[PDB]
Structure 1
C-alpha cells in the first residue's frame, strides 16, 4: 500500500502512473527536490533558441494534476538525504525551511536521474558559466542572454548537449567555440563518421578545438575568458557540457549496489539487491541487448520504459526489461546524426569479431528532385553476420534508417536478412533498395 518514489520526472512519474492505474488502494508519495514535475528536458535547447515560446510548454503534467486527478501525494522541494532500508524509512529535507520529514515505505523506487558534471576549475562560479539540465538552468542561460551583451560563446564538451547547444547559439547569432579534450566532437561516432560532423560545424563557422584541456575561467563578477593549456579565449557565456553523474550519493550507507560511476544495479525487474527497493531511469544501469551486460546509457526513452516497468513490477505485475540498444539521435544544424548498437570502439573493447560496411548513398531515388546524400555505416559479426550497430548521418531520412536498424538489432537479425525485408519504396521516400539493404549486400 505504501509506495514511495524519489524523483518526479520521466522514470518516477511513469512508475507513479502505473501504480495509480493498477491499484485503487495504493498510497503514492513522490519526492521531488525541485519545484517542477514531468517536464521535457529534451526541449530546453529549443526554448533557449527561441523555437519554443517558453519553458512552460515543456511541462507534460502539472503537480496539481498528479494530486487532484490521480491522488498522488506529490511533494515539491523535498530533497531525500538518506534511506534506511532496514526500517524502511526515507528521510527528506525541505530545501527552503531545512525541516526533515520521514516517509515509511513498503516499496521504494529511486528515480533521481543524473546531474551535469562541473569539474573543479578556477572560475567555476563566475556569472555566465552554465550547466544545462533543468528548466531553471535554461532560464539562467536566458537571463545571461537578456542582461549581458553576449557575442562570443564557448562550449566545453562535444557530446550530445554540446552539439545541440552549438546549434542553439549559432541560431541566436553568436560566435561559437567548442572545446573537446578528445580527438573529435561527436565522440560516440567512429572516426570516419565524425568527419561529417566536423564539416557541418566548420560550414557554420563553429570553431572546434580538439585535444585541448580547460584550465580555468577568467573574469570579474562574470566570465570573460576560457583559459586552456593552449591559449586564452574571449567568452561572454560558457556552457559546460562535459557529462553527467548519477544522483545516488545519498545512498552511501545502504547496501544498495552501484556500478563504478554510481549507477544503481537493477535486475530484469528493476529490483536492486536490497529487498523492496527498485531503481529506474538515468540513475540505474541499463542492460544492453548487444553487449549482454549492464551498461549506463542515460536517455529519456529508456527512462520512461524503465519507469513504467518499475511501477508494473512494484505491483508484482512481473515483466522483464528487454534492454537498451544505445540508440541516440541528434539534430545538428542541417545534419541529423544517428547511432544505435555498437560502434567500433565498443566492439573492440568487447573482443567481438566484427566487420564494417559503409555506403555513401542518397535518402531517396537518385533521379528525384532534392534527393540528398546519406552516409550509412553498419557493424556486423564476422562469424555469424549478426548485425551489431549502425551510424547514419545526413540531411533527411536518417531517423527512418536508424529506427529500422534498431528493429533489426532488437530481433538479432543477420546483416543479410535485411535484404529480404519488404521495406517501403516510392521515389519521394526511398530507393528501390534502401541504403541499409545496399550496405547489407556489400557485407561478407
Structure 2
C-alpha cells in the first residue's frame, strides 16, 4: 500500500503506472533528484543537431499529469541519500534547501539509472568539457555552441552515444575528432564489422584516433586542446563518453547485493536480496537470454520492460523477466549499425563453441532501383547450431534484419530453421531469400 520509487524516469514511472492502474488503494511516492520526469534521453543527440525542435519535445509525461491525473505523489529536487531497509525508511535531501525528508515504505523500488563517468583528468572542469545524459546536459552543450565559436570538436570514447554525437557535430558543420578506448574494442562489433564504421567515419571526415590515451584537457577558462600520450589537438568543445556507473552509491551499508560495477542484482521478479526492495533499469542487472548470466546492458527498452515488471511484481502480480538479448541499433551518418546476442568477443569469453557466417548481400532484389549493400554476420553454436547472435550493417533494411534475428534468438532457434520461415518478399523490400536465410544456408 505504501510504495516508494527512487528515480523519476523510464523504469521508475513504468513501475508507478502499473501500481496506479492495478491497485486503487496504493499510496505512491516517487523521488526524483532533478526537475524533469519521464523524458526520452535517446532524443538528446537529435535535439542538439536541431532535428528535433527542443528538449520539451522529449517529455513523455509531466509531473503535473502524474500528480493530477494519476494521484502519484511525485517529488522533484529530492535526492535520496540513505535507505534503512530494517526500519523501511527512505531519506531524501531537498537539493536546494538541503532539508531532509523521510518516507516510509511497504515496498521500495530503486530506479536510479546510471551516470556518465568523468575520469580524473586535469581540465575536467574547463568550460566546454561536457557529459551528455540529461536535458540540462543538452542545454549546456547548446549554450556552449550558441555562446562560443566552436569549430573543432573532440569526442572521447565511442559506442552509441559517441557515434551519434559525432554525426550531430558533423551536421552542425564542425570538424570532429574522436579518441577511442581500446578496452572497448570488440565489445559491441567484431573487428571485421567495425571496419565498415571506420570507413564511414573516414568518408565524412571524422578523424578517429586509436590506441591513444587522453591525459589532460588544456585551456585557461575554456577548453582549447586535448592532450594525449601522442599529441595535443585543438578542441573548442569536448564530449566525454567513456562509460557509465550505476547510481547506487547511496545504498552502501544496506546489504543490497551489487555486481562488480555496482549494478543491483535482481532475480526473475525484480527483487533484490533484501526483503521488499526491488530494482529495475540501468541501475540493475539484466539477465541475458543467451549468456544465461546476469549482465549489465543498460538501455531504455530493457528499462521500460523491467520497470513495468517491477511494478507488477510489487503488486504480487507475479511475472518473470525473460531477459535481454543485448540488442542495439545506431544511426551513424549514412549507415545503420545493429547487433544482437553474442559477438565473437562475448562467445569467446563464455567459452561457447561457435562458428560464424558472413554475407555481403543487398537489402533487396539486386535488379530493383536503389538496392543498397547489406553486410550481415551470424554466430551459431558448433554443436547444436543454436543461433547465438548477429550483426548487420548497411543503409536500409538493417533494423528489419536485426529484429528478425532478435526474434530467432528469443526463441532459441537453430540457424538452419531460419530457412523455413515465411518472411515477406516483394521487390521493393527484400529478395526471395532474405539475407538472413542466405547466411543460414552457408552455415554448417
TM-score range, shorter chain: over 0.9
Asked whether the 8 Å contact 1:362–1:373 carries over to 2, the reply is yes
Provide the secondary structure at the position in 1 that maps to 2:37.
Answer: coil
Listed as ranges, the matches of 1:50-69 within 5 Å are: 50-69=50-69
Question: Aligned partners of 1:328 and 1:53: how far apart in 2?
Answer: 25
Q: Give the superposition deviation at 1:65.
A: 0.2
Tell me the distance in 2 between the aligned counterparts of 1:35 and 1:136.
10
Q: 1:341-399: per-residue Cα shift (whole Å, max 9, x none)? A: 00000000000000000000000000000000000000000000000000000000000
CA contact (8 A) 1:247 1:283 kept: yes
Secondary structure of the 2:44 match is helix
For residues 62-109 of structure 1, give each alpha carbon's deviation from its aligned partner in whole angstroms, at most 9, with x where no partner exists.
100000000000000000000000000000000000000000000000
Moved more, 216-225 or 180-189: 180-189
Residues 184 and 21 (structure 1 numbering): CA distance in 2 closer, same or farther, change over 3 Å?
Answer: closer
Q: CA RMSD in A?
A: 0.8
* Displacement of 1:186: 7.5
Give me the whole-angstrom Cα distance separating, in 1, the residues matched to 2:403 and 2:216: 41
Quick one: structure 1 residues 196 and 186, their matched pair in 2 at CA, closer, same or farther if it must change by over 3 Å?
Answer: farther
1:339 aligns with 339
Deviation per residue, 1:148-176 (Å, 9 max, x gap)? 10000000001111000000000000000
Is this contact kept in 2: 1:115–1:246, CA < 8 A?
yes
Q: Aligned equivalents of 2:30 and 2:175: distance in 1?
A: 43
Q: Per the alignment, do residues 183 and 254 of structure 1 end up closer, same or farther by CA in structure 2, a change over 3 Å counting?
A: closer
Contact 2:187–2:345 (CA under 8 A) maintained in structure 1: no
Distance (whole Å) between structure 1 residues aligned to residue 48 and residue 118 of structure 2 = 21
Asked whether the equivalents of residues 160 and 186 of structure 1 are also in contact (C-alpha less than 8 Å), the reply is: no
5+ residue gaps, structure 2, are none
**Residues 287, 293 of structure 1: 8 Å contact kept:** yes
Do the aligned residues in 2 keep the contact of 1:36 with 1:63 (CA within 8 Å)? yes
Per the alignment, residue 5 of structure 1 pairs with: 5
CA distance in 1, matches of 2:368, 2:120: 54
Pairwise CA distance, 1:432: 0.1
* Counterpart secondary structure, 1:91: strand
On the 8 A contact 2:186/2:345 being kept in 1, the answer is no
Question: How far apart, CA to CA, are the structure 2 residues paired with 1:320 and 1:158?
Answer: 33
Equivalents in 2 of 1:90, 1:297: separation in Å? 27
Distance 2:338 2:43 in 1: 18
Shift of 1:182: 1.5
Q: Secondary structure at the match of 1:64?
A: helix
For 2:266 and 2:170, locate their aligned partners in 1 and report how far apart those are by CA, in whole Å: 41
SS of equivalent residue, structure 1 residue 375: strand
- SS of 1:15's equivalent? helix
* Cα deviation 1:211-251 (Å, max 9, x = unaligned): 11000000010000000000000000000000100000000
CA apart distance, 1:185? 6.8
Structure 1 CA distance for aligned equivalents of residues 240 and 158 of structure 2: 10
Question: Hey, what's the Cα distance between the residues in 1 that align with 2:410 and 2:132?
Answer: 32
| Alignment size in residue pairs | 444
Shift of 1:187: 4.4
> Is the Cα–Cα contact under 8 Å of residues 83 and 254 in structure 1 kept in the other structure?
yes
For residues 372-431 of structure 1, give each alpha carbon's deviation from its aligned partner in whole angstroms, at most 9, with x where no partner exists.
000000000000000000000000000000000000000000000000000000000000
Tell me if the contact between 2:14 and 2:307 (Cα under 8 Å) persists in the aligned partners. yes
Distance 1:186 1:241, change over 3 A: farther
Mapped contact 2:280–2:307 kept (Cα < 8 A) = yes
Query: 1:380/1:186 Cα in 2 relative to 1: closer, same or farther (>3 Å)?
Result: closer
Contact in 2 for aligned 1:183/1:211 (Cα 8 Å): no
What SS does the aligned partner of 1:142 have? helix
The TM-score with structure 1 as length reference comes to 0.99
String of CA shifts for 1:108-146, please: whole Å, max 9, x gaps: 000000000000000000000000000000000000000
Between the aligned partners of 1:187 and 1:228, the Cα distance in structure 2 is 23
Deviation at 1:181, TM superposition (A): 2.5
C-alpha deviation, 1:261, in angstroms: 0.2
Query: 8 Å contact 1:158–1:187 — kept in the other structure?
Result: no
Distance 1:179 1:440, change over 3 A: same
User: Distance between the aligned counterparts of 1:299 and 1:43, measured in 2?
Assistant: 13
Shift of 1:183: 8.1
Are the aligned partners of 2:363 and 2:435 in contact in 1 as well (CA < 8 Å)?
yes
Report if aligned partners of 2:38, 2:62 keep a CA contact under 8 Å in 1.
yes
Task: Please report how far the alpha carbon of residue 178 of structure 1 lies from its aligned counterpart in structure 2 after TM superposition.
Answer: 0.4
Tell me whether 269-278 or 187-196 shows the greater mean CA deviation.
Answer: 187-196
Go from structure 1 to structure 2 and tell me whether the alpha carbon gap of 1:262 and 1:25 turns closer, same or farther (over 3 Å shift).
same
- Superposition misfits of 4+ residues, deviation over 3 angstroms: 183-187
Residue 183 of structure 1 aligns to a residue whose secondary structure is: helix
Structure 1, unaligned stretches of length 5 or more?
Answer: none
Question: What's the secondary structure of 2:176's corresponding residue?
Answer: strand
